[model samples]
Target: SVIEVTDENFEQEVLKSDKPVLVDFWAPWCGPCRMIAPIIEELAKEYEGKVKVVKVNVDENPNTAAQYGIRSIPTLLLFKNGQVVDRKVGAQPKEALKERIDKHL
Candidate 1:
């Protein structure tokens, strides 16, 4: 399962994460965001030890979203050493997302 990240917890949960982190910025009301939700959940389990998967509710955590310049929904960010190494905007296949994270790993 993916961890829940908030604007309040983003710094500690994402920036300070020990492993490579996948920060998925989404909102409950977005159809595309919902479509890709399961893929993220699966990765959270499949990549359990190698990567840390977390969700950021853009509606509730807009500060972090705005800081990252997220004008789109379902923006996925790969973080290493407290900085973004890669980004994917919009819905994509799990395989593609895996590739995105694996490249960083």
Candidate 2:
């Protein structure tokens, strides 16, 4: 269960959150985006208290996407203390995401 965010709520949901945030920037029609979608949801549940997982559709949230310089789909950005700490563009395995998330925690 990933939290869906837009430019309007991006600050409220991600940037200002107390927990570390993982935002999967994606588009509905992107194949790679679809590939990593399930992992994002799993992270939401698995890391329920430790981290916050977010999903943003570039198609609907163009402003937020552009501000983050999302030139490609499936861009996974990790934020802590309202600042970007890590980023992974394109599809990736759960292990990779988990390893990174562990460091943030």
Candidate 3:
């Protein structure tokens, strides 16, 4: 399962991760967010030691969401060495998400 990233631990968990980090910014009420939940979970398990996969609830972590300019739910952000290297907005196929992450890998 993907780690739950909150505003308090956003920096430590996502930004400071030694490995690449995938953050799925979403809200519990978002249908699209739910649509990609399984994919995020699969990636979390598949990437195990290779990378960090986490979910940040936009409604709960408004500060972090605002900081990232997350105007839309289910915005996937890829971070490397504390900097955002890639981003994808809206729901997408698992392959597309994987391809984006592969660029960082």
Candidate 4:
């Protein structure tokens, strides 16, 4: 499952996670975000145990988004060891995303 994160839990849930986390920074009004939502879900299930799949509502979690410099919707950030290791902006194919994750795994 894609864990929805907020500013309150950003540090503990994401920054302090044991496994790598894929954070989907998105909003309800973003069409591209909707398009990639299912892909994110599928990735969550596929990478279960190996990685963490999460989401942040950019509108609701403005502080976290602003801190991350989220200027665009559907920004996927891969976090490992409490730091951002990779990022994918805009929409992307599942295979491409898997490849991105594979590098860290």
Candidate 5:
């Protein structure tokens, strides 16, 4: 299962993680975010040990969202060693998302 990361634990679960982190910035009302949810789930399973999949609810954690400068929902960020290496906005195909993760891996 994907971990739900809040502003409080963002640094611990993601930034400080030894594994590369896939941070999904989304909200409950975004349709596109919902559409990508299942793909994220599959990636969470497929990437199991290589990547740490976590979600940041923009509605609930504004600080983290604002810090990341998330202007839109469903912004996917690939973080390695606490830095963002790649990102994608809006809904995307599973293969496209996987491709980014593969690069960081």
Candidate 6:
């Protein structure tokens, strides 16, 4: 499963991660977010040793969401060296997500 991220751990888990991190910003009530949840989990397991995959609940952690200016659910943020290198703002195929991550890796 994807690691759950919150405002309290955003900096350490994402920004300070030694490896590349993919943060799926989502909410429980979001249909699209639910649709992509499984894919994110799969990626988390697949890339367990290569990358960090995590989920951020926008509803419960508004601070991190607002800090990233996330206005859409199911937004995927790619972080490397403590900065956002790329972002996808909607539900996307697993391949597309992997492709984006590959660029940073």
Residue 85's lDDT within candidate 3 is 95
Taking all chains together, the TM-score of candidate 2 against the true structure is 0.95
Candidate 4 worst ten-residue window by lDDT: 65-74
In candidate 1, how many clashes are counted? 0
Segments in model 3 whose C-alpha atoms lie over 4 Å from true places: none
lDDT values of the candidates? 0.92, 0.90, 0.92, 0.94, 0.93, 0.92
Q: Please estimate how well model 6 matches the true structure, expressed as its whole-model Cα lDDT.
A: 0.92
Q: Report the candidate with higher lDDT, 2 versus 5.
A: 5
Q: By summed lDDT, which 10 consecutive residues of candidate 3 come out lowest?
A: 91-100
Question: Which digits, one per residue and each the tens of the lDDT, describe model 6 over residues 1-105?
Answer: 578999999999999999899999999899999899999999998999889999999999999999999999899999997999999989988998999889989
lDDT of 4 by residue, 10-65 (tens): 99999999999999999999999999999999999999998999999999999999
Off by over 4 Å in 6: none
lDDT of 5 by residue, 1-105 (tens): 899999999999999999999999999999999999999999899999989999999999999999999999999999999999999998999998888778878
How many clashes show up in model 4? 0
Per-residue C-alpha lDDT of model 2 across residues 18-92, encoded as one tens digit per residue = 999999999889998888888888889999988999999999999998888999989999999799999889899
Which wins on TM-score, candidate 1 or candidate 6? 1
Return the lDDT, model 1, position 58: 91
Per residue, candidate 1 scores C-alpha lDDT tens digits across 21-91 of: 99889998899999999999999999999899999999998799889999898999999979999999999
Give the CA lDDT, 0 to 100, for residue 87 in model 2: 88
Residue 69 displacement in candidate 4 (angstroms): 1.0
Q: TM-score of each candidate? A: 0.97, 0.95, 0.96, 0.97, 0.97, 0.96
Q: Is candidate 3 or candidate 4 better by TM-score?
A: 4
* Whole-model alpha-carbon lDDT for candidate 3: 0.92
Error of 5 at 52 (Å): 0.6
lDDT (Cα) of model 2: 0.90
